[PDB]
Structure formats: structure tokens, C-alpha cells
């Protein structure tokens, strides 16, 4: 039923709300010229899925073609919104006057506006899913926790995933002092293809379980990856399936118990 | 006047195409739908890049056949078609999203990487391009396409007149057979049926003949892709009148019986 | 003791396990022609030693007869194991250093695509007797040589139930909770009895949500069970846990452990609610 | 013939050494027990083959009269000679640690029974890894002084053919690292703009299909009374892929003992 007309400052990040919608199932299609934009929803009323599209300075039409094209959409109901964002903000992501003057149509009618100036990309993203999920306080509640066999297993765990056999990043003796929220020894592991297939396949085991276990009244679901020290390949593996699910919309909660002193 | 056409795995940087295709000039629209395809391009004539991809590929080819025909008159359908290998694609996933985020789930990564080419293979199968992006960085897939028919040239020349300047390829004849030894050939060239019926009777010139096309043979394909429009192949003797004519003019016939637009030339001849 | 065969293609670390054998203690002989090789053995017999040769492209005899009978010489108390390391065509492409003959004993090749093919062709009975196989395409320099370290220093699966009021097992390795799956406590008749007791086992295996969680858990074991057999892992320790350790956990850990004996593995059960 | 013998402390050069004598076509065995120089000598003289052994710390017998012993039992065909490398105590350290000083000194009276029998003696003492193999070559092959010469030079086309050349060889297809604004500073000589171009398999390929190329004529250039061969590479700026291939080209022939001589005529500027 929702079309999600996103724009904004070319540099305040409509390409990543964007892209967080698609993850959570929305169509999206980007920069698309104004006057179709009616064309496209019948198209997909038939489908019926949820729609999110993109108007920026590259396609923005006289703001008359904007009233008269939103005024066609049929069936689906819509909503517009648009970021603002600093100008050292905007250069530092990526005239400029002119570049503020044109989007005064869509700056006008946004029901939701967001001030991304001091968001990073992770930050940015869970901020929208928010606005548009809703911090939804009465569903169960993921953590992902990283800990090391040799200190033992937390005792609120739920499951226990035993990480040991993977690629161990101490045998480059460079990555030995870093964790594995570190960047190079992510990409000490993501050149591996058992790296991927292990969070792959966790997390597709995860959600085989998911619903049984959203629905049946559980406040919390405790997952602990663990390696022998806590530091490294447990970390990443953590926060990454972490991660995946934060995308899939979910409530989600990383720690990482070694890392934490 | 043309309509581009990303496309390929996921993982195979067709997000980089596009971005590249932008800052070259193109109108991009991701991820419009098939059957739309010309509605934007009726809208456009008064060039633009399209992506298709396993979210908007209709997995029967006849909508795709269909929406192609419908494109206005003034447009030329041209289709790019980036992959890569398997685990490299693999490696290349940031293990946080759907791989495919609107069609059901899947096996494995193998297997949702796999169910991708199968998905794909007609708009592969009709790829007028394929780009292995399966040894290249972020930046250089982004500088070979900023950087994007061969007709080869083959000329003989003198060493004692000097290389000619327009030369990509330069190769020394002078250590094979030389004709010299028949005095009633030495007025003659390479062009004159005697001394081609010396060089032929020889094993060991053909012999210098079929390794050399064999080694112009490897590169040939990568030169015709990168915006050359000609290719000068110089093969060279001490005077230029016999053995590098005929070789040169040898080389010539065999590409011409490959198809290839080939053109001959004789710099000690000429003069 | 140990007679340490490094084999494999050209480029694939056969040289960096001979350098990480010797940092762990063999005595390494390098390009010995095989029919030395006995020789090369009751050599160090005497001196107690375990020794590492390489057979590669410029040794190994062509004739499988010659390896064999070579084999067959060796003095009784060494024990051969044949290592073999592979990698990607191209990978080997990648590493060759462009400026040393791939084969400097030998006819020369077509290509460097087909050099490497015809080095496949010419190991094949190495690689076929092969007792242990690397893919080492991934590697980097240090983690070849540390991979070897650390498995240079047979499994049994456990599958223990337990209940999550009492806390979990210290020596579990996963950890697999089932709280959700149909509670046999609906039946009060179910109530005194234990998952091995026959009814209990009846109501679990009437519900076919039941077989598809052992069904999937014990699939997702199967994806890691080949590299925690070669990491040199004594013991695998699967913890299944409800929140009395009574019914359905002591059913699933039994079904996994039955399960893994039909693949011919090691395997062993245990229940610590029903061992109090 | 010939059965060569390399030893010296360790961190002198010595497996350096070895391979070099491999790349020109010697057999070599490395580490192999003292005891069996003979047996292995017996096997390899019907073979009609020349070889070269390595006698070490870690194999060289503590009582020097099993070494002397075994080398007095070595067969009729095979003729010995002992090459030993030294080098400075600095030196040996830095070459070892990319791989106590009481153990180097007590261990350098292991090598004395070599040492003074060594027909060759080597001081690897500044030498970098190209050096001390372009040196052995030289005592081993003679200096070539009457051999053809291979001339490898890279240039690029915007300044012209250089007039010299023989052969002319063009990679402006391949991978260009200018690509990456890393590497824009950069000549073909550097370690990073190596480095993008070894990650590309058809510039592995084009540098082996090109020497295959040249050595299916040498016999016959090496013998018609040519005194140079020049062969001569080309991209457009003669900074980055030329400058690689052509000392690529140039190591390789290097390494199978022939006359040769690099020379990149736009870093030469």
C-alpha cells in the first residue's frame, strides 16, 4: 500500500534509505523521471508489493509537473520523505544555491524530514528504520554476543555457535594486536569462502527458528559466537550476523564480551 | 540514441557500470520494470542506461522480447554483461542483506549465485559484451569502460631505411632462408612467383610464419575490443625486396581467410 | 615414526610445508630421486629422526611401478603419509614468477595453462594415495605455514542433553535450544516419564515439526563436520537444552547421536538431568 | 659432468646459489645426508646428467673424516668442486632473520673441512638477491665475452621506436595500472606497480608467450655472426607496463645464463 518518495541535498544520503528499504522487501527503483511516476505504481498495484522511489536534483522536472504528476497516483498510498544536510557534511559523503532552490517543491510537502549531518552509514540506517518501523518495544529482542571458550560460555545464552574452525586471523602476525571490528582482519577473513558460507548458513538456520520463536512469548533470543580468544574471528562473525538481521528490520543487540573490559 | 543495458550476477559491479556510465553522460534508471522499457524511451527521444538484473529479469524471454520491440525508432539496443567467477562473487558479498531480497530463499550461496545464471542466460546469450570482472579492482572496471571495426595493416620494410613510425609490432626475418643464393632471383621481390616457390620450398619458413600469426593470434581479441582502429604488424629484412615482402603479404592472406579486415603494404617498393 | 611425502603442483606451498616441517623439527631432503628414497630412510633409522621429502614434477618417476616398489623398501619402523597441496589454475598463474623455467628438466610447454594441466596429469597416483589434501588457493605465506603448525601438535561427537534452569554444560561446543518445539507436557500421562521412555518418544515423533528440527539441525552439523574432523579436535560436544532437560532435549540428543552413528562417526550420548 | 658442491654459514647465499645452478638445468638435491653423496652420484651418472648438492650445518657430520671419506668414494663420471660462500656477521643476520652469536661461532668450526677444501670461495658479503646470482653465473659460465647479446629496452610510443631495435613488442592492451591513482607516480620498477600488474593472469601469459616466442629463433640468431639483438617494448608512456615486462623479459633470460642487458630509455631521462 506505501510509495516512498525519498529526496533531498545531493550528499545527505537518499542512495542509503534507499537501499535500507530494499533489504526490508520494498521495489525501488532510483532516479526515475518524474512524469512516469504514476506509470510505474499501476504496473506494480497488480503485484502488490510496497514501492520506494528517488527524486533528486537530476530528475526533479517547473514544480507544476510535480503536483500534477503525484496528483495521478492511483490506488497506494504515498509518503515523501527528504534528508537535509550540512554543506562540509554533503562534500565530505559525496551550485550549491542552486542546488537548494530547485528541490523548494519537495522541501515544501515532505511529511518526514531528517537531519543526517552527524549520521555515519550504520547510524544513518538504523535511524530510518525506526521512523518507519517504529521502535517497536513488545518484540522479541536478538543479541548476538561474542565471547572466548577459554573465559567460558555465557550463561544467558541461548545458542552457541562454535567458530574455531574458520580461518584464524592470528597466523598473520600483523592482524595479532587488532579485533575483528578492525579492517583489516574483516578482510583476512572475507577472502575466505567458509568465512561467508558459516554466517550464510547460521543465519538461514537462524530464521528456519525465527518465527516459532518471535511468536511464542519470549522477551529475549541469546545467540553466543565463540572462539578461543574473543578477539578476532568470533567478533567479526558476530557482529555480522548482527547485522543481517538489523537489515531484515529485526531488534537487534551486539556485544562482545572481550572486547567490553 | 542508445539504450544501455547493464546486466550479470550479482556481484559482478554492474552497480559500478552504472555510476561510470553516469559520469560519462547517460540518463540511469535502476531497476525499472521490463515491460516499461520503451515508455521510458519514448519519453527520453525528445542516450540512457538501464539496468537488468535478477530483480527485474521476467524469467520468460518472451517479455523481454516483446518490450524490446516496442522501442522507439530513434534508440539502439546494445547489451553489457559483466560476471565473474563463482567464489569471487562469493567474497565480494557484504554478508549483511538478501541476496535476493524479493524472490525466495535458497540453498546456498553456490546454489543462489548458480539459480542467477540460469536465470540470466538469455540476456547473457545475447550479450554483445562480456566482461570478466573477475580479476579487477573498484577503480580499474570503473577505467576500462571510461576507456571504451580493427583493420590490421601488414607492411615490410628495409632495416637499412629505418622503422616505420606507425609500427605496433616489429619482426626480424633476416636469420631465415635467404633468396640470394639463386642470382637469377636476386632483381626480383617477394611478390614474383620464383622467389615466393624458394621461400615455400624452405620447411623452416612456414614454419616462421605459422608461429607468428600463432602469437598475434593470443592478443588479437584484446586488441579489438580497446579502441584501436588499426593494428601495424612490420616485418622487416635487410633490403625490403624479398623475404619480408612475401612473409608480410603471407600473414596477410592467412588473417583475410580468418575474415579478418586486413591490408598490405611495402614500404622498399613504394618508393 | 614418520615418513613425510610433500606433493602437489608447481606454485602450491609444497616448498613453504618443507620450511614449516623444519621449523617443527623433520629432516628434510629435497629433490632425493625416488629409488634413494629407502636409502635416504635406514639412513636416519638409526638416528631416530622423523624425515619430510618432496616428490614433485622433477622427480616423481612416471612409472607408478617405481613408487611403489620404492615404497615397498622402506625400513619397518617408518610410517609414510603422503601430503598433497593444490591450488586454482590461475592462482598457480598468479604466483609463477615469469622469470625461471616452470619445468627447467624438461620438454618445454605450449602454455603455462597447459604446463600446469600436464603437472595434474603426471601426479595423479600422488594425489590419488594422497592422505591428506590442501587446497592452499585462499592462503596467504604465513597461514600455509601456520595451518601446518598447528595440526602437527580420530573424533568423537557427543551429543548431551540438558536442562536450561540448571545452566549449561562447561564443555559444550554448540549449544542448540529447543524450548519451542511441542512440549509433550500436554499429556499428563507424559508427565513422570523421560525422553527415552517409549510413549515420550511416540508423541515427539508424531509431529513432524519435530523431525524437521532434527532434520535441519544435524544438516547444519554436516556443513562444518569436515573441517572439525581435519583441525586436530579430539572431542565435538552438542549440547541440545529445554528448560527441564527431562523430555524433549533427552529425546533430540538421542535421535542426532543415533543419527551420526549411521554415518559410521564416533559418537556417544549423555543426559545430565537424567544423571543427578 | 660435473658434480658442484654449495655450502657456507648460513645467511651466506647459499640456497640462492643452488637455484641458480637449477635455472641453467643442474639437478639438485638439497639436505641430503653426507654419507649418501656417492649412492646419489651412482644414480645420476648413467643419467648422463650434471649435479649440484648442498652440504650444511644442519647435515655436515660432526667428525670430518666421514665427509672426506664419502667424497673419496665418488664415482669416475662425476667430477667434484666445492663452492663456498662467507659473509660479514651483519650480513649474515639480515638475509637469516628473512628466513644466538655464540651458536653461529660455535657452529662455524662445523664448516672448516669444507672451507679449506672449497675451489671456489665467494664473499656475498654487499651483494643483494639479482647480484649474488648475476655473480655466480660469471664464475661458472665464464664471461660470456664472443655470445650474442640480448638488448631489452622499454620506451614509450608518444616518443618514437628506438632506431636500434630489432624486435618491437606492443602491451598497450594489458591491465594499465595508471588506473589506480596509487600507482601515477610510479615506474614498472616499483613494488606496487608490479604488484597490479601480477594479479592479472594475461600478463603472466604475455610475458611467458613472448620469451617462448624469442627462443624458438635464438638458436638460429645466436649463431649467424649477430653480435646484438635488441628487442624492444612499448606502451604509450614507457613508464608502467613496458618498464615492467621488459626487465620481467630481461630476469628471465638472465636466468638461463644468457648475455643480457636492461635498459629503460624514458626512466633514463
Not at 542512495?15 to 526490508?24: G, I, K, T, Y
Not at 557534511?89 to 559525496?94: A, G, M, S
Not at 515532505?110 to 535511524?127: F, P
Not at 553466543?224 to 529485526?250: N, P
Request: net charge negative.
Amino acid at each position: 500500500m506505501v510509495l516512498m518518495i525519498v529526496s533531498g541535498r545531493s550528499g545527505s544520503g537518499k542512495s542509503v534509505a534507499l537501499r535500507a528499504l530494499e533489504d526490508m522487501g520494498f521495489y525501488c527503483v532510483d532516479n526515475l523521471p518524474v512524469v512516469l511516476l504514476p506509470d510505474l505504481a499501476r504496473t506494480l498495484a497488480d503485484r502488490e508489493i510496497s514501492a520506494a522511489v528517488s527524486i533528486d536534483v537530476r530528475n526533479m522536472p517547473s514544480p507544476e509537473i510535480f503536483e500534477q504528476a503525484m496528483s495521478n497516483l492511483p490506488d497506494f498510498s504515498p509518503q515523501l520523505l527528504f534528508l537535509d544536510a550540512d554543506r562540509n557534511t554533503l562534500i565530505r559523503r559525496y551550485a550549491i544555491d542552486k542546488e537548494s532552490d530547485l528541490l523548494e517543491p519537495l522541501r515544501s510537502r515532505a511529511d518526514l524530514i531528517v537531519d543526517t549531518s552527524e549520521m555515519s552509514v550504520h547510524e544513518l540506517a538504523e535511524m530510518l528504520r525506526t521512523r518507519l518501523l517504529g521502535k517497536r518495544e513488545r518484540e522479541l529482542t536478538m543479541v548476538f554476543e561474542s565471547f572466548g571458550f577459554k573465559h567460558g560460555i555465557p550463561i544467558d545464552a541461548d545458542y552457541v555457535f562454535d567458530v574455531r574452525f574458520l580461518p584464524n586471523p592470528h597466523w598473520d602476525p600483523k592482524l595479532r594486536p587488532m579485533t575483528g571490528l578492525d579492517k583489516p582482519v574483516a578482510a583476512f577473513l572475507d577472502r575466505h569462502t567458509e568465512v561467508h558460507n558459516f554466517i550464510y548458513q547460521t543465519r538461514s538456520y537462524l530464521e528456519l527458528w525465527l518465527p516459532m520463536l518471535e511468536t511464542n512469548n519470549r522477551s529475549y533470543l541469546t545467540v553466543a559466537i565463540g572462539c578461543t580468544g574473543g578477539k578476532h574471528r568470533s567478533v567479526y562473525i558476530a557482529e555480522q550476523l548482527a547485522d543481517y538481521f538489523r537489515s531484515r528490520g529485526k531488534n537487534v543487540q551486539s556485544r562482545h564480551r572481550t572486547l567490553e573490559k
